[PDB]
Amino acid sequence: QIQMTQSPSSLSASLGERVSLTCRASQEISGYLSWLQQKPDGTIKRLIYAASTLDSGVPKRFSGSRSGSDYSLTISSLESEDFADYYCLQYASSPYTFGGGTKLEILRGGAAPTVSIFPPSSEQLTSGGASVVCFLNNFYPKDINVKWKIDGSERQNGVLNSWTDQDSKDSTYSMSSTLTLTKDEYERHNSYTCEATHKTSTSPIVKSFNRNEC
């Protein structure tokens, strides 16, 4: 029941860079602190135990150290394979406590999204609903802005967005934006536009379709 304070909560680092994660305990733990990495598939895997002893098979580029209160994990040279969330753990006192964790995002070159729009399926329509979907794929940075426009006017109500966690293979993100209306509202407008604004471009990426004519 010792509180572990971890920093930074998150960071973006270019591959090859040095990363230092730090953990502080609310009371003495005499080096009984581990650093585990939770891989993207949920897998938890200890890297260091006893504050600075590497587990076997753990790459030599990881190392722990203690500086008074400070417990430090250092990754000299980030590898793509080190894409994960890192947490520190104190196993000194009977109620084990983890650090807040650190969400590591791998810094990368700009990437413009590949925008695609999808009109409501016939199945949904028969159901009385109309969901227009737009997929903004493989971009970077994660910051992106999506606007929905029915005919001319920009619709704000009924949009449900969802981002993708950084792709562990190409360091890009994807987004999915959905505007949901009833079949009666859908059936009485024409063009449905999904325009995205991203750092990679000055003008909005626009995709649309006019319904009408089955």
Binding site: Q1, S34, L36, Q38, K39, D41, G42, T43, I44, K45, R46, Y49, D55, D85, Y87, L89, S94, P95, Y96, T97, F98, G100, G101, T114, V115, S116, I117, F118, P119, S121, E123, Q124, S127, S131, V133, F135, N137, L160, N161, S162, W163, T164, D165, S174, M175, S176, T178, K207, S208, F209
Partner: protein, 219 residues
């Protein structure tokens, strides 16, 4: 390599109970202590309990102290986690781990078991998103699949029974009201579709729902 499969999870009415399991394999179960770690939705890992191999030492987090009971069946290579007086705060993904947190292989399906503390199951409605417009990528065309209106999570989604794994993005479920919507996009070559039949396979275990939806031309 050591494999460890969590498998209790599901919807539970608050105040309700649940008993999770973790099938350890790949090592001498009997010689190791084990842990139960959990992770809330927008929160980080949290240690839950610990049990020595002799079941002689048992630690529980202050949080679950008194409602959860850890146990294991040595000749059966299994760890258990009896949950009780389930609070919404217990809603999280549960993972079991060897005492030394040795990175373990999981199940073909994934890692951990989710258990939601809440209200009512609802089957999703799977809808095929074809182009017409469905704005390709280039000489590559993208197709989608929308799973909407379901509860609770998870829903398993694959393309062509898993054969189609490259180019697919499955965006995480988003709860609106008290139902979830999830979508998946898959990018194939302009040459693949509509020639090669692409199907969206969705499974919502929590309601015995399993649907396969073939994406066909139009929009």
């Amino acid at each position: 390599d050591v494999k460890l499969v969590e498998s209790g999870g599901g919807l539970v009415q608050p105040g309700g109970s649940r008993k999770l399991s973790c099938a350890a394999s790949g090592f001498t179960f009997s010689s190791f202590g084990m842990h139960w770690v959990r992770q809330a939705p927008e929160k980080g890992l949290e240690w839950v309990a610990y049990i020595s191999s002799g079941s002689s030492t048992i630690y529980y987090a202050d949080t679950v102290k008194g409602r959860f009971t850890i146990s294991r069946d040595n000749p059966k290579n299994t760890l258990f986690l009896q949950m009780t007086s389930l609070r919404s705060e217990d809603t999280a993904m549960y993972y079991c781990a060897r005492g030394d947190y040795y990175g373990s292989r999981g199940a073909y399906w994934g890692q951990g078991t989710l258990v939601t503390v809440s209200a009512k199951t609802t089957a999703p409605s799977v809808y095929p998103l074809a182009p017409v417009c469905g704005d390709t990528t280039g000489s590559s065309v993208t197709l989608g699949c929308l799973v909407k209106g379901y509860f609770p999570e998870p829903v398993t989604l694959t393309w062509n029974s898993g054969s189609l794994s490259s180019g697919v993005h499955t965006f995480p479920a988003v709860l609106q009201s008290d139902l979830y919507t999830l979508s998946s996009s898959v990018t194939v070559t302009s040459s693949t579709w509509p020639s090669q039949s692409i199907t969206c396979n969705v499974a919502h275990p929590a309601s015995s729902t399993k649907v396969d939806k073939k994406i066909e031309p139009r929009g």
